[PDB]
Subunit: 506 residues, 4 copies
């Protein structure tokens, strides 16, 4: 009677659902859901990459609090999360896919498998289908049982070359559409959900696609013509990007078209190459949509659609060639701006939210809706007021994101160039109505983007005419960090009668 | 072979040992130790009051990390501390006094005595003598057994009135000097240490005095003439103090001479009153000094002096009427500037350190000296290079302190006047060679004190001529927060072979 | 290169593989494995029912040590088990089916799903396929997706009635053979194991069948003619069984043919009924065998058969009408005597073991073979010496089993009749070469079965001619309990240099 | 309002307070308390020695359950004890002395001081004064400060030799009576208890004396003439003792007069020697008595006597030359029979209890009286009904004791002579109204003592006339083990609504 369906699409841009790229991709099921629900237009990931972003989404805390700042950085074992809190509400959190959680070494034996991968499922989640990108054993066994020939898992991602053996960038995937990673995970959800109907269930479905190595099964590989797509938003050359801030030198080098596909090691970043990858990515998104329609159809068929809290989002964005860069290890909005659709029984269908919302607001929304206590450790705030077309009077007027550009055992390109250590790798972003401020822990100058001017296309931090804006935004950023320190026990008080707690948000 | 003697005097100002007040107080044993050891002249508490400031000293972390931000705010049970780490080195940490540790409610039964007091001993410490200000059962029993008449513990702190019954502000204490709180604790140390000689011991001895309720046993009560003491450093009136920044309104109103003594509820803050309290305070510091000489004499007599790491400091300072304020719930240096003497076998005797040192540097110094691994959670750095007259090239160039002006269950005077909640109570101080910057989490403007100008006697943050200094120092403060986030697991990495760690400090 | 395949068949009698019933059932794959491996002929479960038996098999301890004495009795969270110990060896224990583990309430939130079922998976096991008898959600969803009509899970177990609607006892199951519980679990193993090939895997496959509610899909339902089967071994009537020991009154009443099937509430225990249930049970065993052949074929096809430790056993026996009783809540051998086949690279193929072996010997055998330390808590001993046709000189000369006939919240039929409480429900069995002794914690007399006389068909404990045998066996039983008390820390010693441990078995 | 005073005298025989030795020793304060309270005449320790016997008293469990079976054998960290349970009731358990608790290696760092001694204080106890026999640092420091000359702690226990330097067996102790171990501990209790008056306190005071090395300060050393004392109860020679059962060979050889004193390595067990040790022991018991009178006087003086639950007992007994043996590593009653006096407001003064009581009954009595839930793990039963002169109808009809004659790292004299390992060291004793039965885990025959015949002076287990009594008592012993298995979670049940518990005791 009270179900929770939490879908995370890895790496889908907000502008593909609504915005600059929306008219160049077919997303009917996601657009039909938005039409029958609440869409959040100013929704941003609080951190990057995949690991820190998921840690934040699943714990409801900023990276400065949860401290799983990089892929492989452990998360404290006693950190309250959506699964642990939903278990207190009597739910068995069902997992279809991955959580990308780096386990606490203090909670396991040194030789335990859980400490050998940063793709490991988070404490509290009950895994029904394991579908981690680097280990998709059920999907790999499915392809082997289907009669697909592959001596290595990496061979599965190589696009089919031409008849003459010539490698083809947008060549169809070695697997048919019905045997794809997207189709298979959806099939596993539909093979396991029927018996859960009637009881209160919590299902967490995580789609990797669209995501590198970029390959799509027939007909999605060529469904979109690269020649009819818009070119990425970028300055004329890679050196013009690096000229805006020295940070962009390592950023445009971190990822490339050559690292986003398998079988093309010497791949040149030409307009033909860039547009092909862009078309493959969009085809993978239409494939995800198609399979999401089947998930929705199942809820309607079982009469469970109206009695379910549906949460659809993307973990982080993707540059997609924008600003001569790929991936999400950068400071531009496209790496953080993510779609968010929430359907709840009695919500305002077709309602569009313009207020800044954060990835950390998801966990408290779910707990609020089920009627479970939100821990004080949670930095995020429930989006429930927005569901009935309203809003809280004391809402955020800016959004905040973090990044870490250090790696403890293998120094990053930024560390090799600028010479900072792994305690000074933190980057912070503050998105104000007019400005975007970027501040580094390391000895790198701030970035300032004026949306009333050139926007993200010009770093104006060195301009003395913007000194008062720079000082005001940086104090606003300083205050945010001071107002959002670890609240696990900071609102508890030791009194003569015992320990007494104060609720963080009223 | 390797002993550790860690003495902490509560509320002793740095300027009493060396500085403005040094010539008005006799501290021969502390000054003799400084002459035979290393003195740290720019040593500051990283937080306040007692509880937070004790949590920082004993954990080696900033309050932003340990999160025991106010008296009664719980400290995480799994937080590494000097006692837990010394236990790994094979030491039994002996406690003579108090730690003022607010226990983790998650680690105890709801009705446990440990959760009813914020004066409770820290995990790992083995208590030999209990001597917490609000308790002191061994000392209270010593007083009853010696035949002192008192129906309430609060009666013990009331100064002896005149023969005619007239209350006397600097009246001698009810107890004789040999029966005092200072004498009794020293006697308990000397009644228990003889059998520890020969074995490697770690003793932690904590003197409350000098500390309110201000009362000194004969002859200390009147040893210093209030009429011959210098007046406090202050602006002419209370309104001049508060005109500098609104924070000082509630800050000068938080403590008073009337709250620093027992039996004078209507006590007027006259110059006669202020100077009397100041003379009583200095008399208690001299009595602490005489008893510390007995502790040193014991080490020399047993031939344990040369083979012992001696650490002598104060937890925090005391305004003592300076700037029309009392206590340590403020932002001025007198509340944080603390004496620090370190004697180690082979140190440079009489060496004076001018580099900025922090209270969090004590725990890593002890661990380094015993040869025990310093946890990555520790924000402080070992002072060991300074002991042989050297100094690390990458050492601190500024000091950092924090305060919390909010109370979750009982709103403070600042909360009542300024309207902020318990998530916005944080204050931060950055002490640069020239400037001191104060920044609030709440919507209160910064403070800026120029030490080449009027010093602390003028807040220059609103002066346009200091706008560039203000912006530069605030970025330096922002970077400090970003460079010192929780390091418990942030330097650990999940690899294909298991979890691997990176050492924080060089 | 070093794999572990651990198969548990729930409720299969030892005499079906080799013995009295072997010639009346086809088990070719299990018999082919025995021909190419080591068979253990005197193998007994140390406890009953399913829960305590599994607890013992998975922990390697007697019920007197693990204390999970009934279905629903919690097992201590820190109890070392095969999964926790295999995780230390670097294995991810893969679960296909169930463990029937009652979780520790001290380790979970009061409202957690893990505390609402005693079928919950054991700590350390990674569940790939959930197949718990009372909740087979993947199998129930498979039947629903296949187009099977059922409004209740209990309807799935009702045998197909005749054309005219007349209920038929050995009617075929509502599901076809390819859609059965046995077939489905085997399919899930084969859908997930291919990608594990090459790496060291540990797979735990648990078959419920043969087990009530007795129903078999076509053609297994009628494959064996009830008219050509031998009748159960029993005294002439139910009252003759109860006359041997008053214990047998509640035992023959606990289970019945009517409780072993669904859709026959008034089912009479006629010879026609008893033989039909017996034929259905044997058909379910041939179905299990058939699917085990597919598991073996997969290992051979992948070239993983010779490099795998294969362990095949049954958890507990089944009375199957023997002694006018059904199930395993009794003291006769048929309830405990279980098949055991172990194949290891380099073992003696076709070797038959006659020495008494216990269910607790499985966990130490696996750990020994992988080269992982066996905890001292483990009461069982490695069967590795028997694999090369040898045996240890200090082996057991008797086997030991336990049962609990109390229920804390709902008093059993034994408690209602004899009037004992839930601290006196323990029963103990000692199987000597000649005698079997049964001793009760409650005020019920012992049982003594002389195999050189009438065997289990006559309780001779009241015969004064057997007083010396009774006294000798009871002292042997007393000594066994005293020699097998909780060894978790009893072999550890606190010394002046620290804690030192002594290995339980050399 | 509700105080708990728990005094434990180490090694005081029951027959010294009332019985065979009572007329040869002055115990006025203990006898005055018995006259104003309830005395338990059939009170026995459930295990031995000190460590196991202290673990049973403080946990309320049999050694078969708590498993700290020898000195140095760790006790599980999560074992509920009197201190942990009293902390739930809001009490701070104050310790004056020792608990002799072997800590759990799983709960501490490998190098922790707590894992280097089996005299370490039990979890939950708040140590006020440390006074363990192998340590006693406060008492050793009291001795150095008072000016006693000793270069080694062992020199303190050497009796003062004659003027000519001739060693004297009953020579006065080096220290004066006012400086003794007994006097000093009492002084520490009285120096710390005054400030606890008014509040609800729980004080645990543990006197080592009477206990080896046997030495008494003047005038106690010679207060009793060894020539006027009765000789021990024994068979004529050592070989007569050992002829009764081979166990007594190593048991009479384990301790001797030479091992019960310091400075006499070649001490002959003559009647003069034996009687001298006996007179010294009785003199130390009289000195314990004088100091207990001061503890009682304090309660009366403060008006806290009538409002306090007073529990006075001994941990175990002492052979004292009886049966040619010393100490408590034996099976005779003198090693277990201990005095027990309980005073509670409203009890029947002068009431004498004859029912069998056990050391495990103390913890549940205290918890019951304070109104705190008794855990199911507790094997003991509250003695509260007996306090008002009543007796439960389902009370004990026999008492049960255990011993362990094995040592994991250093094989005992029994292991060396009989050849059994450290899993077979358990001994069990059952005291019936007429018989005493002794059963070994190792292959040693039982002992049977008829109290209507020769008592303990003849082992009658081999007599055919006692074969039926032997079999009956051994079944009663078997049933006791089966009725008292670990109850930590065995009465908890996993249900569809969660975990539900059943109360152990009626």
């Amino acid at each position: 009677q009270s179900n929770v369906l939490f879908i995370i699409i890895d790496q889908l841009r907000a502008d593909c659902l609504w915005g600059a790229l929306a008219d160049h991709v077919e997303l009917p099921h996601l657009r039909a859901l938005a039409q029958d629900a609440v869409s959040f237009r100013r929704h941003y990931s609080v951190t990057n990459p995949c690991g820190p972003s998921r840690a934040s989404i699943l714990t409801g805390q900023y990276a400065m609090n949860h401290r799983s700042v990089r892929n492989g950085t452990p998360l404290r074992h006693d950190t309250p999360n959506i699964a642990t809190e939903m278990r207190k509400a009597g739910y068995l959190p069902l997992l279809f896919g991955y959580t990308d959680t780096s386990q606490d070494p203090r909670a396991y034996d040194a030789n335990d498998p859980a400490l050998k991968t940063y793709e490991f499922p988070m404490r509290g989640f009950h895994e029904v289908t394991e579908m981690r990108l680097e280990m998709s054993y059920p999907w790999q066994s499915h392809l082997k049982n289907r009669g697909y020939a592959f001596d290595d898992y990496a061979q599965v991602y190589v696009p089919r070359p031409d008849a003459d053996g010539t490698p083809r960038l947008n060549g169809p995937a070695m697997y048919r559409a019905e045997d794809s990673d997207t189709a298979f995970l959806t099939d596993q959800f539909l093979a396991n959900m029927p018996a859960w109907a009637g009881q209160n269930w919590f299902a967490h479905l995580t789609y990797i696609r669209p995501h590198p190595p970029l390959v799509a099964p027939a007909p999605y590989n060529t469904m979109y013509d690269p020649a009819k797509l818009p070119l990425p938003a970028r300055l004329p050359g890679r050196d013009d990007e690096t000229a805006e801030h020295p940070f962009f030198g390592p950023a445009t080098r971190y990822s490339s078209p050559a690292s986003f596909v398998l079988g093309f090691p010497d791949l040149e970043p030409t307009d033909e190459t860039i547009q092909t990858l862009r078309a493959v990515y969009l085809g993978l998104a239409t494939e995800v949509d198609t399979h999401i329609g089947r998930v929705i159809a199942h809820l309607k068929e079982t009469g469970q659609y109206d009695d379910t809290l549906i949460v659809v989002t993307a973990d982080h964005g993707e540059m997609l060639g924008d600003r001569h860069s790929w991936g999400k290890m950068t400071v531009y909005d496209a790496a953080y701006h993510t779609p968010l659709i929430i359907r709840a029984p009695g919500c305002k269908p077709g309602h569009v939210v313009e207020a800044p919302t954060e990835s950390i607001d998801l966990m408290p929304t779910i707990l609020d809706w089920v009627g479970q206590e939100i821990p004080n450790a949670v930095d995020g705030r429930s989006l429930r007021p927005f569901l009935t077309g309203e809003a809280p009077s004391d809402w955020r007027q800016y959004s905040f994101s973090e990044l870490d550009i250090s790696e403890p055992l293998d120094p990053t390109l930024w560390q090799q160039e600028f010479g900072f250590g792994p305690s000074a790798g933190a980057v912070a972003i503050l998105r104000d109505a007019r400005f975007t401020l970027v501040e580094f822990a390391a000895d790198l100058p701030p970035m300032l983007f004026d949306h009333q001017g050139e926007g993200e296309f010009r770093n104006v931090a060195g301009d003395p005419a913007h000194a008062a804006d720079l000082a005001r935004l940086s104090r606003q950023m300083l205050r945010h960090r001071m107002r959002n320190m670890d609240h696990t026990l900071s609102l508890c008080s030791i009194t003569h009668e015992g320990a007494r707690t104060q609720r963080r948000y009223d």
